[PDB]
Structure formats: C-alpha cells, structure tokens
C-alpha cells in the first residue's frame, strides 16, 4: 500500500499489473477548487489544504459537455464519448508511476483534444499505464473545462475573461511542478503532448509566458494554434457570448450582470444553447475556443509566432494521412460510414459549400480547380477522396507544416512525422483511411497488449513509436537507436524533411503537400 504526501495533503494510489510488472496509478487527484457557484466562468482557484487521505483510486468526473450521437451503439463514435459522470466539479488529474518508484523520471503530460467542446482524460486510449511500464516515464493527464463553461469570453471582464480551460491545464502543469518530485518525477524534464485541440493547446503553451517555466519540450499531434478552427477572435467571442445570453434570457445591460445570470442557469441550459451561437456552423466549428485575453495570450498568436515570441525548445509535430475524412460523414452530402460514399462532381461542389460557407463563388472554384487534376479521370472515388484531402489539408496538415517551418526558423530542432497506418481494429469503413485521432492508440502503446488482437506488425510499430516519443521526451531527440531504425532527420525550413511512420517501412521524404499547402497558406487567404 503506497501513499504519497503531496503539498496539499496525503493521497493514496493503487497498483496495477501491466505486462508481468507493476504500475502505480493515482486516478483523480484534485488540482483546483471546484469551479462552481460564483466560481463558474472564472479562472481556476487554488486548492484548499486537506488533512485526511484522499483516495485517488478511480477516474474523476468529466467536465460538462455535449455528447456525440450521430451513431448510437457505434464504437467508432462512442470510444470518444465521456466515460465518467459529467459535472462542473471536474478539475482532476491522473498520475501513472512505474514500479518501483523511479528516481528523477521524465514526466509526460497529456492534453486531450475534442474541438475545445468535448473530451475527458479517462478515455481508454489515453491510459498511461503502458507508457509507465515500458519506458519508465511518468504519465500525467488532466481534465480541463470545455465549451462555454471553459471558454466563454467577455474580454477584459474578469467574470468571464476567456481561456479558463487553458488556465485549468496551466494550473495542472503548476501542480506537477510543485508535486511530481514526491512521485519520483523530474519537474525539470516535462514534455507536453496532445492531439487535435490538445495539440493546439500545447502550441499555445509555447506562447503563454505563464507556461514557459512549467515544461521542457512539446509534442503536437494533428493540430496547432494557427489551424483555421483553433482561435476565435474577439468580435466573434463577443457575438457568441451575447447570442448565448439572448438564448438563455440573460441579456442584461451591465456587462457583469449578464454573467451572474448565466451563473444561476443550470449547466444543461448552457449546453443545449451552445450550438446556436454561430449562425452558420460547419463540422469543424469551435463555438467557444481560445481567445486573445491579454492574460494567457498577450497578443494574436500568428504575430507571436512570426516574430519569434515563443519558448525556444525542441518540438515534435505530425499529422495523419486521412485527417479530413471523419468530418465528411458528419455533414457532406452523399457520405456515410455504411457505404463506399462515391459522390459526383455535383455533390463535391455542395460539400465545399458545407465546409466553406462564407467563401466566394470564385473561392470555391479555385479549390475545385486545384484538387481535380487527376491521374485517372475514370476513378469513381476521385471526388470522394478529393473532398477528404481538401478538408484535411486545409484544417490540419498545412497549418501543422506552417507551424513547424516558422518555429524552426528561430534555431530550434523540429521533427515532423506523417502517420499512414490504418489500425487493424479501426471500426470505421476502409474508405476513410488513416483517420483523425487513430494514431493515439499507437502512441499510448495499446498494441503492446497481445490479447487486444492488434496485428504483430502493429506491436512493433507501436513499440518503435513509444520509444521515439520517450526518447524525445528524455533527450530531445526522437530516435529509435538500437534496432537499426531509419534515422529521423531535423525539419529544416530549407528542405522540410519528415519521417513517414507505418508498419512496412519508415522512410524520409521532403515537402509534404508542397502544392496543396502553397495554395491554402499563400493564395486562399486572399480570396
Ligand atoms: C452576430 O449575431 C447575430 C445574431 O444572430 C442570432 O443570434 C442568436 C440569437 C442565435 O439565435 C443565432 O442563431 C442567430 O443567428 C447574427 O445575425 C443573424 O445573421 C444571419 C445571417 O448572418 C441572419 O440570417 C439573421 O437574420 C441574423 N439575426 C438577427 C437577429 O439579426 C450576425 O450575423 C452575427 N454577426 C455577423 C457579423 O455575422
Ligand atoms: C450512401 O449512403 C448515403 C446515406 O443515406 C442513406 O439513406 C437511407 C435512406 C439509407 O439508404 C441508408 O443506407 C443511408 O443512410 C446516401 O445518401 C442519401 O441518398 C438518398 C437517395 O439518393 C437521399 O434521399 C438522401 O437524402 C441521402 N442522404 C445523405 C445524408 O446524403 C448515398 O446516396 C449513398 N451512396 C452510395 C453510392 O451508396
Ligand atoms: C461533434 N462531437 C459531438 C463529435 C464532439 C467533437 O468531437 N467536437 N470536435 C470539434 C472539432 C473541431 C475542430 C477540430 C477537431 N474537432
Ligand atoms: C475526438 N477526437 C479525439 C477524435 C478529436 C476530434 O475532435 N475529432 N473530431 C471528429 C471525430 C469524431 C469521431 C471520430 C473521429 N473524429
Ligand atoms: C480509502 O481506501 C481504503 C482501502 O480500501 C479504505 O479502507 C478507506 O476507508 C477509504 N477511504 C475513504 C473511502 O474515504
Ligand atoms: C534531477 O535532475 C536534475 C537535473 O535534470 C538535478 O538538478 C536534480 O538534482 C535531480 N534530482 C534528483 C533527486 O535526482
Ligand atoms: C454593474 O456595473 C457597475 C459599473 O458599471 C459595477 O461596478 C457593478 O459591479 C455591476 N454589477 C452590480 C451588481 O452592481
Ligand atoms: C528491438 O528488437 C527486440 C527484438 O525483437 C524487441 O524485443 C524490442 O522490443 C525492439 N525494440 C524497439 C524499441 O522496437
Ligand atoms: Cl530498471
Ligand atoms: Cl466530371
Ligand atoms: Cl461546373
Ligand atoms: Cl472504396
Ligand atoms: Cl498477426
Ligand atoms: Cl524502420
Ligand atoms: Cl492559385
Ligand atoms: N507534393
Ligand atoms: Zn472533434
Ligand atoms: Zn498520401
């Protein structure tokens, strides 16, 4: 029986059997004052000391959120849905420790994605006990507020200043700084990693001065702050905030007196009104996201990046081959997870209206013109794959590549990857390829469990990725040095080399999406 004395009081963990050994788990450690009552919409308050033994033996409450329901009973959407109660009392974090207690172990801190509207750290594919067991690192994950309750912005107003979820994360980073030592961790060797909006989060942590000293290195999986969906400006933050008030009957004149109205509304009142704060949404819509608050963010992030105003350190950045296909079955006409989704030129044209609603007719013609120069004009899946590439190149890949070029231009080592393996267990149809979110299980080493009926080639690739992530965390270099692997080159802005990750062969390529990204990053802004 192990109990660790944190600065805030004693906490009792539990022991797990992983791969013939032990990992100690502390699920559900509180790291903030519960943000309810008058604390709703506010920055996270500090934790009051306690004098008993907190039993950190089960996952905590998940933060209030709206749940995916487009496919009830379907594992492919429900693996992402919360697996603990929803409650405003949700600011908790988890710690996996190798056994026996390491001395000065590198800490990995996971920040989950979900469009800043959904997510929870208790998901099975975020289980950190494999990483603890295999690479003797410490894995920490936290829950952070999402949707309106985590990102409602009345800018300047401390009653709802914006970016509360990001301050939740930061307060958890503060926690492992003040406490990880007692678990055997090295507060000086802390690597942030996250996926989708989690990756956008860690990219903002590279910019936030208040995060500069709370971590060492950073891993960005399928996301960056410069992605079109990732930052909401101040005028849409306010139109959205005031729309929600009109929806709940909280329109008041005194700016502050709008907030106390929302603070006495039930959590489900705000949740079901969230979707309608934008007049025309898209499958990629982030209704309440990060803003320039003058606190977490001191200025617009694109300016900070372009002028080298970020934490200088190594980064690991990468994308998946079919980032965009997940979003097609949530909106585009003619798409279905239950057929081959072969669409015509006409249907391709109406998908662009879904994904680019307020963009010109000349804008949409140029997208179609760039993405329809086929090798084979007879392929019936031409337009299907093309609209998938359009959505994936615009929302994830081209921003991620631009982030890596601009970050590396200031002298730091950067490492870019291209994940192109489709999981043998992936419950979505084959036409959707290597989907958004489905490298996560490889990173967390789930195929390392042979009972889980992953393929043998998948155990090897996960083992090699798990090693490259932990080598990057520990030593700032994502090599696998022993089994004669391909050496991962630095991403230099001149040649733009990256590593493809897959079962058959890891090769070195250059200038991922050369043409597609020039169009999206240089031309498409001007239309
Ligand atoms: C700023 O917001 C207004 C408000 O729109 C409504 O706000 C809530 C009450 C909610 O019910 C939303 O779904 C509403 O749309 C936007 O005004 C609307 O704009 C659309 C088209 O853009 C128009 O068809 C509606 O008639 C407008 N509604 C009203 C009440 O005038 C407005 O568009 C937003 N700002 C910008 C620049 O678009
Ligand atoms: C692929 O399937 C989509 C999905 O819609 C189907 O509609 C049901 C009636 C049923 O047949 C289910 O298997 C699917 O969910 C098809 O798109 C629909 O097409 C019909 C007829 O043309 C139209 O009335 C609907 O509005 C369409 N709905 C959507 C969301 O697009 C599509 O035609 C199928 N294509 C192929 C090649 O199989
Ligand atoms: C919509 N759903 C109920 C499945 C929750 C969710 O997943 N919301 N996510 C939005 C988003 C936006 C941009 C990039 C990635 N994700
Ligand atoms: C939820 N996730 C961690 C995958 C990121 C996200 O928000 N993805 N967005 C849509 C989606 C929905 C189901 C399956 C795949 N992608
Ligand atoms: C914590 O767990 C121990 C071991 O089961 C138990 O004896 C103790 O009463 C628990 N404390 C609680 C639930 O407050
Ligand atoms: C842990 O490592 C740091 C350097 O990274 C060192 O300064 C510190 O004293 C070490 N502490 C322990 C307990 O090993
Ligand atoms: C109303 O506005 C004033 C300033 O305009 C502010 O000081 C006050 O706190 C607000 N709310 C209440 C309940 O007075
Ligand atoms: C290297 O090869 C050995 C022998 O097959 C294997 O057991 C080990 O897990 C491999 N390590 C990595 C990091 O791939
Ligand atoms: Cl050892
Ligand atoms: Cl055609
Ligand atoms: Cl046409
Ligand atoms: Cl097919
Ligand atoms: Cl096999
Ligand atoms: Cl290899
Ligand atoms: Cl062009
Ligand atoms: N290319
Ligand atoms: Zn999403
Ligand atoms: Zn490709």
Domains of the chain, start order = 3-326+393-516 (3.40.50.1820)
CA distances from 116 to 55, 150, 166, 209, 486 (A): 29, 8, 10, 21, 36
Residues 6+ apart with CB under 8 A from 4: 10, 11, 13, 26, 182, 183
Q: Which of 364, 382, 365, 381 is nearest to 373 (CA)?
A: 382
Name the nearest CA neighbour of 280 among 228, 333, 355.
355
CB 117 within 8 A of CB 281: no
Burial 416-431 (b: 16+ CB within 10 A, else e): bbbbbbbbeebebbeb
> In Å, what is the CA distance from 303 to each residue of 225, 229, 292, 396, 397?
12, 17, 12, 19, 20
Known catalytic residue at 360: no
Spatial CB neighbours of 374, under 8 Å, sequence gap ≥ 6: 382
Per DSSP bridges, beta strands 315-320 and 217-221 are parallel
Closest atom of ligand 8 to CA, residue 466: 13
Chain centre distance of CA 236: 22
Angle among Cα 168, 206, 26 to the nearest 5 degrees reads 40
Taking a C-beta distance cutoff of 8 angstroms, is the pair 159, 199 a contact? no
The pair of three-digit structure tokens given for residue 26, joined into one six-digit string: 């502390």
In sequence order, the 6+-apart residues with CB closer than 8 A to the CB of 229 are 115, 284, 285, 286, 289, 395
User: Among 233, 298, 301, 269, which residue's Cα sits nearest to residue 149?
Assistant: 269
> 451 to each of 374, 426, 457, how far by Cα in Å?
43, 16, 14
Per DSSP bridges, beta strands 185-195 and 138-142 are unpaired
Pair of tokens at residue 133? 């067991």
- Structure tokens that stand for 494 in this block: 């001149």
Q: How far separated are the first and last CA of the chain, in Å rounded?
A: 63
Q: Beta 497-501 vs 508-510: how paired, if at all?
A: antiparallel
Beta bridge partners of 171: none
Write down the catalytic residue from 135, 159, 274, 323.
323
31: tokens are 């790291």
Gap between the Cα atoms of 412 and 463, Å rounded: 27
Please, are residues 448 and 130 in contact by the beta-carbon 8 Å criterion?
A: yes
Task: Give CA torsion, residues 91, 275, 162, 82, to 10 deg.
Answer: 20
H-helix or E-strand containing 406? helix 398-408
CA distance 267 to 259: 14
Cross-strand bridge partners of residue 27: 57
Q: What angle do CA 89, 79, 418 make, to 5 degrees?
A: 110
- Strands 138-142 and 92-98, bridge-based pairing: antiparallel
- The answer to whether 92 and 30 are in contact (CB under 8 A) is yes
Pull the structure tokens for residue 438: 């489905």
Whether the Cβ atoms of residue 167 and residue 140 lie closer than 8 Å to each other: no
Specify the residue for token string 């009051």.
48
Rg, Å, the chain Cα set: 22
Respond yes or no on whether the N-terminal peptide bond of residue 100 is cis (omega within 30° of 0). Answer: yes
User: Which pair of tokens denotes residue 66?
Assistant: 């709206």
Residues found in the chain:
527
Written as six digits, the tokens of 67 are: 């749940």
Measured CA angle at 318 (ends 391, 302), to 5 deg: 70
Specify whether 203 is catalytic.
Answer: no
Phi, psi torsion values for 306, nearest 5 degrees: -65, -25
DSSP SS3 for 447: helix
Cα 57 to Cα 27: distance, rounded to the nearest angstrom: 5
> The tokens of 302 are what?
């694109």
- In 3D space, the residue among 45, 30, 189, 178 whose CA is nearest the CA of residue 109 turns out to be 189
Residue 122 bears catalytic tag: no
Model resolution, angstroms: 2.5
B/e letters for 14-31, b = 16+ CB within 10 Å, e = fewer, are: eebebeeebbbbbbbbbb
SS3 content of the chain, % helix, strand, coil (to 5): 35, 15, 45
Q: Which of 70, 72, 327, 336 to mutate to test the pocket of ligand 2 (most atoms within 8 A of CB)?
A: 336
Atom 7 (ligand 6): residue with closest C-alpha? 188
Q: Is the dihedral of CA 306, 310, 313, 317 positive or negative?
A: negative
- List the catalytic residue out of 211, 436, 439, 441: 436
Angle at the Cα of 110 from the Cα atoms of 107 and 113, rounded to 5 degrees: 170
User: How far apart (Å, rounded) are the C-alpha atoms in residues 211 and 372?
Assistant: 44
Residue whose CA is closest, atom 18 of ligand 2?
A: 334
Phi, psi of 454 (to 5 degrees): -75, 160
CB 387 within 8 A of CB 343: yes
C-beta 463 within 6 A of ligand 8: yes
Torsion angle in degrees (nearest 10) through CA of 371, 326, 452, 93? 120
Pocket lined around ligand 7, Cβ cut-off 6 Å: 254, 256-257
Residues 112/141, Cβ–Cβ less than 8 Å: yes
């Amino acid at each position: 029986d192990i109990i660790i004395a944190t600065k805030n009081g004693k906490v009792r963990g539990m022991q797990l059997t992983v791969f013939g050994g032990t990992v100690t788990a502390f699920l559900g450690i509180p790291y903030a004052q519960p943000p309810l009552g008058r604390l709703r919409f506010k920055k996270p308050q500090s934790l009051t000391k306690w004098s008993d033994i907190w039993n950190a033996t089960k996952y905590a409450n998940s933060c209030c959120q709206n749940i995916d329901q487009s496919f009830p009973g379907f594992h492919g959407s429900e693996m992402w849905n919360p697996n603990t109660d929803l409650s405003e009392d949700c600011l908790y974090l988890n710690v996996w420790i190798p056994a026996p207690k390491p001395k000065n172990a590198t800490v990995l801190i996971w920040i989950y994605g979900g469009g800043f509207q959904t997510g929870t750290s208790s998901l099975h594919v975020y289980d950190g006990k494999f990483l603890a067991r295999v690479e003797r690192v410490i894995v920490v994950s936290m829950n952070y507020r999402v949707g309106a309750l985590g990102f409602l912005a009345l800018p300047g107003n401390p009653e709802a200043p914006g970016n509360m979820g990001l301050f939740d994360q930061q307060l958890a980073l503060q926690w492992v700084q003040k406490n990880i030592a007692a678990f055997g961790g090295n507060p000086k060797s802390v690597t942030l990693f996250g996926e989708s909006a989690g990756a956008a989060s860690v990219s903002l942590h590279l910019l936030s001065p208040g995060s500069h000293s709370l971590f060492t290195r950073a891993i960005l999986q399928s996301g960056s702050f410069n992605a079109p969906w990732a930052v909401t400006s101040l005028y849409e933050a306010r139109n959205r905030t005031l729309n929600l008030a009109k929806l709940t009957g909280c329109s008041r004149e005194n700016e502050t007196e709008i907030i106390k109205c929302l603070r006495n509304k039930d959590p489900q009142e705000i949740l079901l009104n969230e979707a309608f704060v934008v007049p025309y949404g898209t499958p990629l819509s982030v209704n309440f996201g990060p803003t320039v608050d003058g606190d977490f963010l001191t200025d617009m992030p694109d300016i900070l990046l372009e002028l080298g105003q970020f934490k200088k350190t190594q980064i690991l950045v990468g994308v998946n081959k079919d980032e965009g296909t997940a979003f097609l079955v949530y909106g585009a006409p003619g798409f279905s997870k239950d057929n081959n989704s072969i669409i015509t030129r006409k249907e391709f044209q109406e998908g662009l209206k879904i994904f680019f609603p307020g963009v010109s007719e000349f804008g949409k013609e140029s997208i179609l013109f760039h993405y329809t120069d086929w090798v084979d004009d007879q392929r019936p899946e031409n337009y299907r794959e093309a609209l998938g590439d359009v959505v994936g190149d615009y929302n994830f890949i081209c921003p991620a590549l631009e982030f890596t070029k601009k970050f590396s231009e200031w002298g730091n080592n950067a490492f870019f990857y291209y994940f192109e393996h489709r999981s043998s267990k992936l419950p979505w149809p084959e036409w959707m390829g290597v989907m958004h979110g489905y490298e996560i299980e490889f990173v967390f080493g789930l195929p390392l469990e042979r009972r889980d009926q992953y393929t043998k080639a998948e155990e090897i690739l996960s083992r090699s990725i798990v090693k490259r992530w932990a080598n990057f965390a520990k030593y700032g270099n994502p090599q696998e040095t022993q089994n004669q692997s391909t050496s991962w080159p630095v991403f230099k802005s001149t040649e733009q080399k990256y590593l493809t990750l897959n079962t058959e062969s890891t090769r070195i390529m250059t200038k991922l999406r050369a043409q597609q990204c020039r169009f999206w990053t240089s031309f498409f802004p001007k239309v």
